[PDB]
Amino acid sequence: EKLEVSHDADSLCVVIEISKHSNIKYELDKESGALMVDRVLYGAQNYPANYGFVPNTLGSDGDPVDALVLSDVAFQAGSVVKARLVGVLNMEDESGMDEKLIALPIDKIDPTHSYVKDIDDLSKHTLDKIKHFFETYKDLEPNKWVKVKGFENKESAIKVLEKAIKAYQG
Amino acid sequence: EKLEVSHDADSLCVVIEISKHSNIKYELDKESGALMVDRVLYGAQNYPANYGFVPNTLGSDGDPVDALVLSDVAFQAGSVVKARLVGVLNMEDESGMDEKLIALPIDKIDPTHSYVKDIDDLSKHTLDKIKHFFETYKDLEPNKWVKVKGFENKESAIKVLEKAIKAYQG
Amino acid sequence: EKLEVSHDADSLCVVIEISKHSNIKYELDKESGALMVDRVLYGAQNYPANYGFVPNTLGSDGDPVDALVLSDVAFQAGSVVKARLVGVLNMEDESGMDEKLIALPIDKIDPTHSYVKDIDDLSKHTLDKIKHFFETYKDLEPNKWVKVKGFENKESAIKVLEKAIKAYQG
Amino acid sequence: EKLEVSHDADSLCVVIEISKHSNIKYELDKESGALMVDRVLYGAQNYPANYGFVPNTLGSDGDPVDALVLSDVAFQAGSVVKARLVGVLNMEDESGMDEKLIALPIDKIDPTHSYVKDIDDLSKHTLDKIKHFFETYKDLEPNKWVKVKGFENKESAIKVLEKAIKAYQG
Amino acid sequence: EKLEVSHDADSLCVVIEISKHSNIKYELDKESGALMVDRVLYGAQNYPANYGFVPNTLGSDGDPVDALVLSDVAFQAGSVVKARLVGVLNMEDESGMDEKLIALPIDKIDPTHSYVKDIDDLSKHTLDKIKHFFETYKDLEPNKWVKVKGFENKESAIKVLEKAIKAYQG
Amino acid sequence: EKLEVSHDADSLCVVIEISKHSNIKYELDKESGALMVDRVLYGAQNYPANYGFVPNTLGSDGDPVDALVLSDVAFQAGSVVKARLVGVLNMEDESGMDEKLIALPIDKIDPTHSYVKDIDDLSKHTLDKIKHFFETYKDLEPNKWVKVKGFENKESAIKVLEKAIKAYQG
Structure with missing residues (x-):
């Protein structure tokens, strides 16, 4: 299945494993392509x-x-969406430092938040909800935890992405 | 509207203001009967x-x-359901000590959990989820907080109810 | 609340207690107006x-x-809908002979099935599903049962309605 | 039921007859309080x-x-919500000139869009969707139509509201 | 994935990319089999x-x-359904003449509309809704438009299909 | 796709073809991997x-x-879930004797029912609902039927599974 990849920070594709408002966390097994x-x-x-x-x-x-991938609608797990970066969320868990890119679907797909140019364009409310979610969604899971540091603008996210792309190439 | 009340700990009625899985908290204005x-x-x-x-x-x-009111289904806000007590959850918030009765719909209505006789019959998982919800659902709300103490069996809940009934009568 | 009634077989109002696709059966307590x-x-x-x-x-x-009240959409329990009769379903339960009018919302409300003039205009599939539902939805309920006889056209339904209206007037 | 009213442009209450994402239009019969x-x-x-x-x-x-009432969540029809004005939508239909106030729930209720101070703070996308909805949601309804003029800021909405309040008082 | 195809006008398979009532338009990338x-x-x-x-x-x-694929239920995007033709919808967009086959799932799958033999058997309401949807669902999309001509019976649809099958074979 | 299989009775994987609360029965075509x-x-x-x-x-x-696979949530059709056996349901249909394993997702996935060790740990209500479903879900389907025998503990289910694994190996 997975063989197409676009890596532009303003047109990179994201493989949805979890849909918005869902409490079921899926994970794709690249080898089988089976939604786990x-x-x-x-x-x-x-x-x-x-x-x-x-x-x-x-x-x-x-x-x-x-x-x-932020948006008003929930995308189906297993689907792919072309998005653009606007920031990144830095946190720490039992495994180590974790980085989560903050993106929005490209406008030719969904322009509801086309006005969002950087992380600071997203409303305070949304950022707190997302941060609070990660800071607590693993509270009841034994020997698991998260300690959110904060968000970083788009320029910072691009570097995270580019570094992640090179690491895979060598 | 509200004029019917049954107060038996095993056949007391609960006025649903919030449905399960809902993120919208409603509150009934007894005078207007308007769902707020x-x-x-x-x-x-x-x-x-x-x-x-x-x-x-x-x-x-x-x-x-x-x-x-625990059950597999979500009841419509504004609806009334005859239930039975099985326990009570004690917590503390910005306003003071808060008590929340734990009940289940009476069997002639829904017998899915008829086997639950006391608080300890409910699975550990469910109790932790409920407790964790209250312990964090007000984290992002300024000057608001909750500190859950724990659960107490049915005998304890009956006393809370009976004390609450007398307080209204005098 | 309830004080408005229209009784024309082609413009009679129905008080929805249960919405389509719902597994929760509500019942309105006319005195309190409380959805039970x-x-x-x-x-x-x-x-x-x-x-x-x-x-x-x-x-x-x-x-x-x-x-x-048949339609593609589910109406909210507690809501009222002006409908028109097209038939009636006759069945027998533990309490005795039961009659259930088959209606459709009036066209100025929803004209999806305006072509349905009589009971025989509804597809076979729908009638079997409805009949099968009633014939089995009480199988697991102790000392309760249903034995569906069948459907009867609109002319038959009008008589059931008119007889039900007179019974209330005297 | 309805007897409570608050009329402040920043704390006025709205009686929800239709929930977001719903295709069923309800209407409250003030006399019966019945959701029609x-x-x-x-x-x-x-x-x-x-x-x-x-x-x-x-x-x-x-x-x-x-x-x-704009928000990310859909409020239950029949419920009441304290909101604040941010603008007004002017349109024309078969009945005449129609005015529709644009509001948001007050922050103590839901602060997701607290940043929206005026009509121009709402994203272009949302305004076009709303305008397009009204401009076409009555296309298939015989002898019915709508011709949207446009939106007007908060100052304009306050005047519409205040004029509507006085008209009821005399 | 895609290697099975049945091409009988009364037993042809359709690959669902969009589910009923959904506002999210998916598209399958045959090479990757990835739902886009x-x-x-x-x-x-x-x-x-x-x-x-x-x-x-x-x-x-x-x-x-x-x-x-018309039916009362919404099929999951990415799923395949054996259907039968009943007509075709002819329209014109920015790209050129567009043809959309009107089908129903075969009876051994879902017989709710087995009575629908031709396009004229579908209710007027449904046809207008579908036609109105396509005639306006691209209004807000820059440099995009649609001009619906109308529907054509089953005999006409079979020719469209057969012509589409031959075009792929050579 | 399908190439991963774990066969431990306490860590065997199940390929979801139908989600809970769904009325649409899907079936996976192993060769195409297409959800039918x-x-x-x-x-x-x-x-x-x-x-x-x-x-x-x-x-x-x-x-x-x-x-x-029993649980409070509905898994997406086409997804795979590691589960554990707790029993088996024996029934008879038009094709012959049918066996359906009763499982629960492994705890590292979802521990809501970790307390369920054997078939007898599941509530009576749930077992009757499941049994009643199969005993009637094919009533309206011509020349199709089901006659449920009953449930059998975990030890019995393991034998069914192990016998099913060997049959595939030779």
């Missing part, structure tokens, strides 16, 4: 946005860099 | 059960004692 | 249509004559 | 926001002034 | 039916002939 | 749990042994 049921959120929570990963990249944890 | 939109949860959360109150009772905060 | 949670279907079923009753009428069981 | 099913949208559409009316006011068409 | 997020409807609309394409065919626009 | 729409339930019913099959096994009917 990784887990069901322990608490009365649900993802604040569409969750996925950028293919052909290597993040800090050995897996392709993760990315959250 | 109290607030939309700040975080990416949703109620772990149906939320309502027992009419003709007076809780610690001056309002009718609150009660959570 | 009567029960949650024991089996893996859901109503094949919107369920309600015609106000100011007296059916065979002492309660206002029941009526099913 | 006015109609089901003829086309493959759904309201771009929560639709309701401000009580104790008299709009251009003889009924209480209408108002759209 | 093509776009989110600009207006407050949603598809009047399941949308997909017939594999191993070549339509007027160079892509496999499109087909709408 | 097998049928839409004739009656007003919906699956009491997630339905799927264990890959690399051969059941009594020539197809991989079937298994129901």
Whole structure:
């Protein structure tokens, strides 16, 4: 399946593994292309946005860099969406430092938030909800935890992405 | 509207103001009978059960004692359901000590959890989810907070209810 | 609340107590106007249509004559809808002979099935689903049962309605 | 039921008759307090926001002034929400000139769009969707039509509201 | 993935890319088999039916002939459904003449509309909704438009299909 | 796609073809990996749990042994979930004797029912609903029927699974 990849920070594709408002976390097994049921959120929570990963990249944890795709609608898990970066969320968990790219679907797809140029263009409310979600969505999971540092603009996200792309190429 | 009340701990009625899986907290204005939109949860959360109150009772905060109605389905806000007590959840918030009765719809209505005789019959998972919800659903709300103490069996809940009924009668 | 009633067989109003696709059966307490949670279907079923009753009428069981409002959408329980009769479903349960009027919302409201003039205009599939639902939705409920006889055209339904209206007037 | 009214442009209450994403248009019969099913949208559409009316006011068409309550969530029809004005949408239909207030729930309820101070703060996308909805949601309804003029800021909306309040008082 | 194709006008398979009531338009990348997020409807609309394409065919626009699968339920995007033709919808857009086959799932799958033998058997309401959807679902999309001509019976649809099958074979 | 299989009775994987509460029965075509729409339930019913099959096994009917995955949430059709056995449901249909494994997702995925060690740990209500579903979900389907025998503990299910695994290996 996965063989297409576009890596432009303003036209990079994200593979949705989790849909917005969903409490079921899926994970794609690149070899089988099979959508795996990784887990069901322990608490009365649900993802604040569409969750996925950028293919052909290597993040800090050995897996392709993760990315959250913000929008009013929830994309189907297993679907792919061309998006653009606007920032990045830095946090720390039991495994180590974790980086999560903040993206929005490209305008030719969905222009509801075309006005969002950088991380600071997203409303305060949304950022707090997302940050609070990650800071607590693993509270009830034994020997698991998260400590959110904060967000960083688009320029910072591009570097995370580019570094993740090179790591996969060598 | 509200004029019917049954107060038996095994056949008391609860007025649903919030449906399960909903992130919108409603509140009934007894005088108008109008379903009021109290607030939309700040975080990416949703109620772990149906939320309502027992009419003709007076809780610690001056309002009718609150009660959570557990079940697999979500009841419509504004609807009334005959339930039975199985326990009570004790917590503390910015306003003071808060008590929330834990109930289940009576069997002639829905017998999915008829096997649940006491608080300890509910699975550990469910109790942790409910407790975690209340312990965090007000994190992002300025000058608001909650500090959950724990659960107490049915015998303890009956006393809370009976005390709440007498307080309203005098 | 309830004080408005229109009784024309082609413009009679139905008070929705159950929405289509819902497994939760509500019942309106005319005195309180409170939407009561009567029960949650024991089996893996859901109503094949919107369920309600015609106000100011007296059916065979002492309660206002029941009526099913067919349409593609599900109406909110507690809402009222002006409909027109097209037939009636005759069945027998533990309480006795039961009659359920088959109606459709008036065209100025929803004209999706304006072509349905009589019971025989509804597709075979829909009629079997509705009949099968009632014939089994009470299988798991102790000491409760249903034995569906069949459907009868519009002319037959009008007589059921008119008889139900007179019974309430005297 | 309806007896409470707050009329401050920044704390006025709206009675929701239609929930966001719903294709079923409800209408409240003030006398009965009964939620009436006015109609089901003829086309493959759904309201771009929560639709309701401000009580104790008299709009251009003889009924209480209408108002759209924008938010990410859909409020239950029949519920009441304290909101604040940010603008107004002017249009023309078969009945005459129609005015629809554009509002947002007050922050103590839902602060997702607290940053929206005036009509021009809402994204272009949202305004076009709302305008396009009204400009076409009545295309298939015989002898019915709409011709949207445009939006007007908050200062303009306040005057519409205040004029609607006085009209009801005399 | 795609290697199975049945081409009988009464047993041809359609690959669902869009589910009924959905506002998210997906598109399958035959090479990757990856479900692509093509776009989110600009207006407050949603598809009047399941949308997909017939594999191993070549339509007027160079892509496999499109087909709408009508039914009461919404099929999951990426799923395949054996259907039968009943007509075809002719329209014109910025790209040129567009043809969209009107189909229904075969009876051994879903017999709700088995009575529909030809395009004229579908209710007027449904046809107008579908036609109105296409005539306006691209209004807000810059440099894009649609001008619906009308529907044509089953005999006409078979010719469109057969012509689309031959075009792919040579 | 399908090439991964784990066969431990406490860590065996199930390929979800039907999600809980869904009335649409999907079936995976192992060769194409295409999710096929097998049928839409004739009656007003919906699956009491997630339905799927264990890959690399051969059941009594020539197809991989079937298994129901119980949980509070509905898994997406086409997704895979690691589960554990707790029992088996024996029934008879027009094709012959049918066996359906009763499983629960492994705890590292979803521990809501970790307390369920054997078939007898599941509530009576749930078992009756599941049994009643299968005993009637094919009533309206011509020349099709089911006659449920009953449930059998985990030890019995393991033998069914192991026998199904060997049958596929030779």
